[PDB]
Design a protein around this ligand. Structure first.
Ligand code: HEM
Ligand SMILES: *P(=O)(O)OCC(C)(C)[C@@H](O)C(=O)NCCC(=O)NCCSC(=O)c1c[nH]cn1
Lengths: 75, 417
């Protein structure tokens, strides 16, 4: 599936660079894709700096996917 | 309460160590089944349990047939691995471990830690005199919690204002203060530490100081600089490693002294050395109950075959109560000699902060014997919950001060002002 806005597209690109893989699903769970702490750290700090948002770690954990994060960012 | 059966005891459950006295359980394992296979529980696999001092020592030493790169505690070992494998010292083997340890020994060697020892002694004295002046205090929060974290933070170069925040996080990473902590809250705490240090490491590489983070950022292993990721992961293991275990040892000594007033008197009256007393405090408390490995190749022990891939857990608490090594093992004896306890582990991964941990306990015992005549528990102590760590999070005490020694301490500070 393709990203549906600029936020989803930018976020998916961050996921890919952090997980070191192409073909990252926008709807897939971060942990089900073999995601761990090292990757989560880089992910959250990069989302915070590039989207100028104070994203809490709990918010990442509750919605650890591109689609969900894009909703939380756009608000 | 004492259990006679072995099958009923589930070592993965933190509640097991609260409701039960496992002294008989460990003795039974030690004499009848030195290599015991703990069954699978829920989604967790089974694992070997090693209870004898001699076997524990032998398996800590073998980094060839056993590995740490799949985790070294139950929570990581039963999950199938540790995310920081090959990067964090404790979960790295081979050449990367030797090189990474060699750069950390530049900072944590007895030679390098001597100026820090003086700071430990001053801070510990100050805190103990405060508690003794008040009389009624909470030893955990008012004394113990304010020494180990502060020491390691000074070494690492953690700003003073962020230290209270880091203590809250540590108290959720591998052990809880509350009964039923989910894996979520622990995950969040562990990753919050990582998020904090990735910010601080980036700041120190951009503008280096003289702290340990700066030493790591300017060090080399195998002719190449350490990545920020590798520095962050080791910072995590130092802030948490240099905090909990020391803190718990310090709290346990005060509780143990009220149980054994004869041994407190020996320390108070100069009838035992601080070195000797520090070792018995460490043998008695054994705050880290277990560490673990995973077998890379097949091996035989006591007629039983440990297959490749098997989780092997070594129980320091059981090893420090072995009758074959320690005469009257369940006696608290400050004069115990020799005292070759395995509280700091053994072999290639032998505790990196062994000297620092000893110095912190040493400083506490010296301060207690000088400015205190005695103490008593006033309220209900609060146990931490963990299958890895053992100890107390809260200990209400009344301290009877040595008034002459406090007055001498105040007069001395008066002329040094
Ligand atoms: C009295 C309190 C302490 C206890 C009971 C304790 C216990 C242990 C044990 C049993 C090990 C071996 C782990 C294994 O074999 O997998 C270890 C290793 C380690 N400890 Fe401690 N420790 C204490 C204090 C400290 C302090 C103050 C520091 C701060 C520097 C520290 C940092 C570390 C590190 C970084 C390792 C990994 C060493 C390696 O992998 O080579 N510990 N500790
Ligand atoms: P995420 O994928 O959940 O991973 C987090 C992290 C990278 C931190 C990972 O390594 C992990 O989950 N570790 C488990 C916690 C742990 O093992 N902490 C160290 C134990 S305390 C210790 O070894 C010690 C030694 N001396 C004193 N204290």
């Amino acid at each position: 599936r393709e990203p549906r806005n600029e936020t989803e597209s930018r976020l998916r690109r961050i996921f890919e660079e952090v997980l070191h893989s192409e073909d990252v699903d926008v709807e897939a769970n971060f942990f089900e894709l073999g995601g761990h702490s090292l990757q989560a750290t880089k992910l959250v700090s990069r989302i915070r700096s590039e989207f100028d948002a104070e994203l809490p770690l709990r918010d990442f954990f509750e919605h650890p996917n591109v689609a969900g994060l894009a909703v939380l960012i756009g608000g | 309460p004492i259990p006679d059966d072995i099958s009923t005891i589930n070592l993965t459950d933190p509640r097991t160590y609260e409701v039960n006295d496992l002294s008989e359980y460990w003795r039974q394992l030690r004499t009848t089944r030195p290599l015991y296979w703990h069954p699978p529980v829920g989604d967790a696999p089974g694992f070997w349990v090693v209870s004898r001092y001699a076997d524990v020592m032998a398996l800590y030493k073998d980094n060839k047939k056993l590995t740490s790169e799949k985790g070294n505690v139950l929570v990581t070992l039963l999950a199938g691995g540790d995310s920081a494998a090959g990067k964090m010292l404790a979960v790295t083997d081979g050449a990367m471990h030797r090189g990474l340890r060699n750069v950390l020994l530049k900072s944590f060697s007895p030679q390098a830690l001597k100026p820090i020892v003086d700071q430990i002694r001053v801070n510990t004295t100050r805190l103990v005199v405060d508690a003794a002046r008040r009389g009624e205090c909470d030893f955990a929060a008012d004394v113990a919690e304010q020494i180990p974290l502060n020491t390691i933070s000074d070494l690492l170069g953690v700003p003073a204002a962020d230290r209270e925040f880091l203590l809250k996080l540590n108290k959720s990473a591998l052990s809880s203060e509350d009964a039923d902590q989910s894996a979520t809250d622990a995950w969040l705490a562990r990753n919050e530490i990582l998020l904090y240090f990735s910010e601080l490491v980036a700041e120190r590489r951009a503008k280096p100081t003289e702290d340990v983070i700066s030493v790591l950022a300017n060090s080399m292993v195998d002719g190449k600089p350490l990545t920020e990721e590798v520095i962050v992961l080791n910072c995590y293991s130092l802030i948490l490693g240099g905090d909990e275990t020391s803190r718990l040892s310090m709290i346990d000594s005060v509780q143990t002294f009220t149980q054994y007033p004869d041994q407190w008197e020996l320390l108070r009256d100069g009838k035992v050395t601080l070195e000797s007393a520090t070792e018995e405090v460490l043998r008695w408390a054994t705050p880290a109950m277990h560490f673990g490995r995973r077998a890379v190749t097949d091996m035989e022990l006591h007629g039983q075959v440990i297959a490749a891939g098997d989780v092997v857990t070594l129980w320091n608490n059981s090893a420090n109560r072995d009758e074959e090594v320690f005469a009257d093992p369940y006696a608290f004896d400050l004069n115990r000699s020799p005292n070759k306890h395995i509280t700091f582990g053994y072999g290639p991964h032998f505790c990196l902060g062994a000297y620092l941990g000893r110095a912190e306990v040493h400083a506490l015992l010296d301060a207690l014997r000088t400015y205190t005549t005695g103490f008593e528990i006033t309220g209900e102590p609060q146990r931490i919950h963990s299958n890895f760590l053992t100890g107390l999070s809260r200990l209400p005490v009344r301290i009877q001060p040595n008034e002459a020694a406090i007055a001498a301490y105040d007069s001395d500070n008066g002329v040094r002002s």
